C-alpha cells in the first residue's frame, strides 16, 4: 500500500480590513490491484530415501483454489548443499527457510492479485505441492577425490522408476521409501532373479528373521501384524495370483513391475503371546485429538478391520484422509433489467441472480433494434456485452451490459417508452429475444 | 519514508479596490507498507574445527518471532578468503562485516514488512542462524601449485559425519 | 475490516450486506434479519436474529 | 482485455518442444547433457510414416 499524509497552514491578509487563518489535514492510500501483495513461505525439505542429495533444489507450487499463484524453482538462497537419508534441510532444531524470491537472481518479490489477496484475508490457505526435485550424487574420479558436479538423479529417476515396484512403510510418523528391482516375465532375456513380497520386503528394510516372521527392529511387520493397502493395479494383480498358489499368502506372490505396496505399523497391537501395547485390559490421552483410526484383528481365519474416530492378533492402526443452457433458461436470465437513464436511455444492465450467472455467461454479442429520436424503428448493429458492476455500485457483482451508445447510431439519443428490441445472439448463431419495450 | 514539505506565497488584486495577500505551508510523509524499512546486520564467521576453509560463503536467517524474514547467501562482498583453525574474519581487531543484500549481484536492499517493523521498534530481536555453510579446501596438482578451486567440502560433509561422533 | 473504522482497532469479521444477491434495495432497519455462519464442515449455526 | 471480458478465449498452441535423451558415455554413466532431439526430428520425420 502506499499511506499518506498531510498538515497545513494558512496565513491571509486583505483590504475595510479583512483577516483569516486556517489548516487543513489529509490522508491517502494508494493500491495495485495487479501486485496488491507479496506472499512470503516458510519450506523444510526432507528425505525419505535411500541416498544423499546434493544441491536439492527443488520446484513448487503454490495454490489457492484451483489457480497455481506461481511454480519457482530454487535459486542460490534455498538450495540445500546436503541432505543424508532421514536428515532435513535445515537441520532439526533450526527455523524454516524462506522462499519469497520468484525470478533468477532473487531480485524480484512473488507478487498476488487483489481478489487472490481478498481471499487470502478471507480465510482461504494456500497450499504447496513439490512437483519436481533436482540435485546431485557423489562418485570419484581418477584420483580418490569425490566430484558431485556433473552427475545428476534426472537421468537415472525415469530408468529406475520404470524397472521397480515402490515399497512404503510408515512406523509412527518415520516414513521409509524404497525401490526394488521386479522381473519381468515376457522378456526371455531379462536375468533379473525373481523376488517374492517377503523377501523384497526383507531386503528393502534390512528386516531380520527369528521365528518366520519379519521384525524390522522390534516391530513386527509380518503381513498378519500390519495393514497392507494397494491401489487399484497391485490389488487385482495380487488377487489374480493368490488363487494359483498352494499356501495362500499376500507375502508369496511373485513381484512384479509397478506394484505400489504400502505397509502401516499399528499403534497399538496384541497377539496374547508377547505383545501387550495397550495401556488397559483406553481413556483418550494417547490417541490423537481429530483423527480416523481402524480396529482390526483375526477371528477358518479372517479379519474385519472396523473403523472409529475420535472426537477430542488384535490391533488399533492409523489412516490417512459442460452444461449448455437451454432457450427457456436464457430468455429467463434476462427477465430482471435495469434501464440506464441520462432523461434519454444510455444502457441495460441485466441484474445477477443465484441462478442466472452461466445462462448471462453464456450468451454475448446483443443485437439491439431500437428507435432513435429524429429517427425511427431500425437496427443499430450488433455489438458486445460490456460486464459492468451492477447499477453502478462498486459492492453489486459485475453484469451483462449493453452499452447502447456505441450502437450504430447518428450521435442521436434514444428514445424512452419507444419500440426497444434486444435480440440476445448465442454462440451457435441463433438469436433470441430477451427484452421488449 | 518521504518526508516533503512546501511554502507558498500568494499575491492578489481585485476591482471599489480589493488588495489581498498571504502564504501557505505545508508538510507530508509517504509510507510504503510492503518494504518500510531495510535491515542492515554486522555478521562475523570463526572457526573452531581442524582445517582452514577458503572462499567461505556461508547461509544465514534472519527470524523474528517465528517468521524467518530472509535466507541470505554470501554475495561476492562478504566472502571470506581465508579462515584458519581458531582464526575470525574479520580478524580479530577489525569491525564486523555488514550483510545488506540479498539478490545475487548485490543490487537489492533486505526489505521488512510494517507489522515487522512495528514489532522491531518495539523491543523485539532479530536473531541469526547459520543453517550451512560452503568452502574450498586445498591440494597440489601435477605441479607444486596448491589449487582451490573445484574442490568442495560440501562432498565429504556428509561422509564425514556418517561414521564419526563429535567430541 | 477494522472495526467501528477505527484505525487502532483490530480486524474483525465483517459482513458487507451491500454486496449480497439484492436487487440494488435497501436493507430495512428493525425488522427480520437473520445472519447464519457457516462452518468448513457445512454445518451452519444462527449466530444473529433480529 | 475487452475483448477476454465479454466472453472470448485464449487458446494454447505448442508450436515445438525441446529436451534431450540418455545415452552412456565412456564410463557406465548415462549423459544427458548435449544430447538434443532436434538433430534427429526431421532425419526421423523425413523417412518415416506416422501411425
Same mark, same amino acid.
Given at each position: 500500500?502506499?499511506?499518506?499524509?498531510?498538515?497545513g497552514?494558512?496565513?491571509?491578509?486583505?483590504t475595510?480590513?479583512?483577516?483569516?487563518?486556517?489548516?487543513?489535514?489529509?490522508?491517502?492510500?494508494?493500491?495495485?490491484?495487479g501486485?496488491?501483495?507479496?506472499?512470503?513461505?516458510n519450506?523444510?525439505?526432507?528425505?525419505?530415501?535411500?541416498?544423499?542429495?546434493?544441491?536439492?533444489?527443488?520446484?513448487?507450487?503454490?495454490?489457492?483454489?484451483?489457480?497455481?499463484?506461481?511454480?519457482?524453482?530454487?535459486?542460490?538462497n534455498?538450495?540445500?548443499?546436503?541432505?543424508?537419508?532421514?536428515?532435513?534441510?535445515?537441520?532439526?532444531?533450526?527455523?524454516?527457510?524462506?522462499?519469497?524470491?520468484?525470478?533468477?537472481?532473487?531480485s524480484?518479490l512473488?507478487?498476488?492479485?487483489?481478489?487472490?489477496?481478498k481471499?487470502?484475508?478471507?480465510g482461504?490457505?494456500?497450499?504447496?505441492?513439490?512437483?519436481?526435485?533436482?540435485?546431485?550424487?557423489?562418485?570419484?574420479?581418477?584420483?580418490?577425490?569425490?566430484?558431485?558436479?556433473?552427475?545428476?538423479?534426472?537421468?537415472?529417476?525415469?530408468?529406475?522408476?520404470s524397472?521397480?515396484?515402490?515399497?512404503?512403510?510408515? =512406523? @509412527? /510418523?518415520e #516414513?521409509?521409501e524404497?525401490?526394488?528391482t521386479?522381473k519381468?516375465?515376457? *522378456?526371455? $532375456?531379462?536375468?533379473?532373479?525373481?523376488?517374492?513380497?517377503?523377501?523384497?520386503?526383507?531386503?528393502?528394510?534390512?528386516?531380520?528373521?527369528?521365528?518366520g516372521?519379519?521384525?524390522?527392529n522390534?516391530?513386527?511387520?509380518?503381513?498378519?501384524?500390519?495393514?497392507?493397502?494397494?491401489?487399484?493395479?497391485?490389488?487385482?494383480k495380487?488377487?489374480?495370483?493368490?488363487?494359483?498358489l498352494?499356501?495362500?499368502?499376500?507375502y508369496?506372490?511373485k513381484?512384479?513391475?509397478?506394484?505400489?505396496?504400502?505397509?502401516?505399523?499399528?499403534?497399538?497391537?496384541?497377539?496374547?503371546?508377547?505383545?501387550?501395547?495397550?495401556?488397559s485390559?483406553?481413556?483418550?490421552?494417547?490417541?490423537?485429538?481429530?483423527?480416523?483410526?481402524?480396529?482390526?484383528?483375526?477371528?477358518?481365519?479372517?479379519?474385519?478391520?472396523?473403523?472409529?474416530?475420535t =472426537? @477430542? /492378533?488384535? #490391533?488399533?492402526?492409523?489412516?490417512?484422509?459442460?452444461?449448455?443452457?437451454? *432457450?427457456? $433458461?436464457?430468455?429467463?436470465?434476462?427477465?430482471?433489467?435495469?434501464?440506464?437513464?441520462n432523461?434519454?436511455?444510455n444502457?441495460?444492465?441485466?441484474?445477477?441472480?443465484?441462478?442466472?450467472?452461466?445462462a448471462?455467461?453464456?450468451?454475448?454479442?446483443?443485437?439491439v433494434?431500437?428507435?432513435?429520436?429524429?429517427?425511427?424503428?431500425?437496427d443499430?448493429?450488433?455489438?458486445?456485452?460490456e460486464?459492468?458492476?451492477?447499477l453502478?455500485?462498486?459492492?453489486?457483482?459485475?453484469?451483462?451490459?449493453?452499452?447502447?451508445?456505441?450502437?450504430f447510431?447518428g450521435?442521436?439519443?434514444?428514445?424512452?417508452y419507444?419500440?426497444l428490441?434486444?435480440?440476445?445472439?448465442t454462440?451457435?448463431?441463433?438469436?433470441?429475444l430477451?427484452?421488449?419495450?
Amino acid at each position: 500500500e502506499h499511506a499518506s499524509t498531510d498538515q497545513g497552514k494558512t496565513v491571509s491578509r486583505a483590504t475595510a480590513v479583512q483577516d483569516s487563518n486556517g489548516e487543513s489535514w489529509n490522508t491517502g492510500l494508494s493500491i495495485n490491484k495487479g501486485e496488491s501483495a507479496y506472499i512470503n513461505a516458510n519450506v523444510r525439505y526432507y528425505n525419505t530415501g535411500t541416498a544423499p542429495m546434493y544441491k536439492v533444489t527443488p520446484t513448487t507450487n503454490l495454490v489457492l483454489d484451483g489457480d497455481t499463484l506461481s511454480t519457482i524453482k530454487a535459486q542460490e538462497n534455498q538450495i540445500g548443499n546436503n541432505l543424508s537419508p532421514g536428515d532435513t534441510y535445515p537441520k532439526k532444531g533450526l527455523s524454516p527457510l524462506a522462499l519469497n524470491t520468484m525470478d533468477q537472481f532473487s531480485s524480484r518479490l512473488i507478487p498476488i492479485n487483489y481478489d487472490q489477496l481478498k481471499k487470502l484475508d478471507a480465510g482461504k490457505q494456500i497450499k504447496l505441492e513439490t512437483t519436481q526435485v533436482s540435485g546431485n550424487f557423489g562418485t570419484k574420479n581418477s584420483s580418490g577425490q569425490i566430484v558431485t558436479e556433473g552427475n545428476s538423479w534426472s537421468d537415472y529417476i525415469s530408468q529406475i522408476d520404470s524397472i521397480s515396484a515402490s515399497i512404503i512403510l510408515d =512406523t @509412527e /510418523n518415520e #516414513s521409509y521409501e524404497r525401490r526394488v528391482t521386479a522381473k519381468n516375465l515376457q *522378456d526371455p $532375456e531379462d536375468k533379473t532373479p525373481e523376488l517374492t513380497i517377503g523377501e523384497a520386503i526383507e531386503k528393502a528394510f534390512g528386516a531380520t528373521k527369528k521365528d518366520g516372521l519379519l521384525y524390522f527392529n522390534d516391530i513386527p511387520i509380518d503381513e498378519s501384524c500390519v495393514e497392507l493397502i494397494f491401489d487399484d493395479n497391485t490389488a487385482n494383480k495380487i488377487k489374480d495370483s493368490l488363487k494359483t498358489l498352494s499356501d495362500k499368502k499376500i507375502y508369496n506372490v511373485k513381484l512384479e513391475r509397478g506394484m505400489n505396496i504400502l505397509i502401516k505399523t499399528p499403534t497399538y497391537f496384541t497377539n496374547f503371546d508377547d505383545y501387550n501395547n495397550y495401556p488397559s485390559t483406553i481413556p483418550m490421552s494417547e490417541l490423537k485429538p481429530y483423527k480416523r483410526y481402524v480396529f482390526s484383528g483375526y477371528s477358518g481365519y479372517t479379519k474385519f478391520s472396523y473403523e472409529f474416530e475420535t =472426537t @477430542e /492378533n488384535l #490391533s488399533i492402526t492409523e489412516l490417512n484422509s459442460v452444461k449448455i443452457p437451454t *432457450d427457456q $433458461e436464457i430468455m429467463d436470465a434476462h427477465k430482471i433489467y435495469f434501464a440506464d437513464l441520462n432523461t434519454y436511455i444510455n444502457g441495460m444492465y441485466f441484474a445477477p441472480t443465484q441462478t442466472n450467472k452461466e445462462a448471462l455467461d453464456y450468451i454475448q454479442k446483443y443485437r439491439v433494434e431500437a428507435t432513435l429520436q429524429y429517427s425511427g424503428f431500425k437496427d443499430i448493429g450488433t455489438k458486445d456485452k460490456e460486464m459492468r458492476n451492477y447499477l453502478g455500485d462498486p459492492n453489486q457483482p459485475k453484469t451483462n451490459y449493453v452499452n447502447l451508445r456505441s450502437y450504430f447510431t447518428g450521435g442521436e439519443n434514444i428514445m424512452t417508452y419507444k419500440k426497444l428490441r434486444i435480440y440476445a445472439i448465442t454462440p451457435d448463431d441463433r438469436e433470441l429475444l430477451v427484452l421488449s419495450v
